[PDB]
Design a protein around this ligand. Structure first.
Ligand SMILES: [Mg+2]
Length: 167
């Protein structure tokens, strides 16, 4: 928990979801042309979204392993529920979960345990203990129920931190 620093999120261009366990793209390729895949989570804006598996409601937890490309020292981490013209703003139901961090994609260390107060919550950032990392692991553990049961869509994930020596 740090004071009002307000720097700017790491440019997620070298980024790339290197691993996940749930998306709508798993099924028919027609979902593919919809831009609802995991990569739709680190493309700079919450305008594009990510959709869970829809043909078969999969039980939680859902996780993702982002590869920031290089090493950093995370200060904060957060995400942002979907936002118009996102086809599923009512689906952003992330309620509880946590985020881990690793430097070799083998050994991980917990950073924090986030919790969103309502469905489709604008942004949810958390102060994460000053830790060195290359890979991040986001995990949704509980979801707010919907008119159509357990559904969930994510807008985007942000990460702050210093960049280690270019070397
Ligand atoms: Mg996005």
């Amino acid at each position: 928990y740090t004071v009002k620093f307000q720097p700017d999120p790491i440019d997620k261009k070298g980024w790339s979801v290197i691993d996940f366990n749930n998306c709508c793209t798993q099924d028919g390729g027609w979902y593919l042309n919809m831009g609802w895949g995991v990569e739709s989570l680190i493309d700079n804006n919450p305008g594009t979204q990510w959709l869970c598996r829809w043909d078969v409601k999969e039980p939680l937890p859902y996780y993702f392993v982002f590869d920031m490309g290089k090493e950093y020292t995370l200060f904060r981490f957060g995400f942002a529920n979907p936002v118009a013209p996102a086809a599923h703003v009512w689906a952003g139901t992330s309620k509880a979960g946590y985020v881990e961090a690793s430097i070799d994609n083998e050994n991980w260390v917990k950073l924090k345990d986030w919790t969103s107060p309502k469905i489709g919550e604008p942004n949810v950032n958390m102060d994460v203990p000053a830790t060195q990392a290359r890979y991040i692991r986001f995990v949704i553990t509980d979801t707010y129920p919907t008119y159509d049961g357990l559904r969930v869509s994510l807008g985007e994930v942000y990460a702050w931190g210093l960049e280690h020596h270019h070397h």
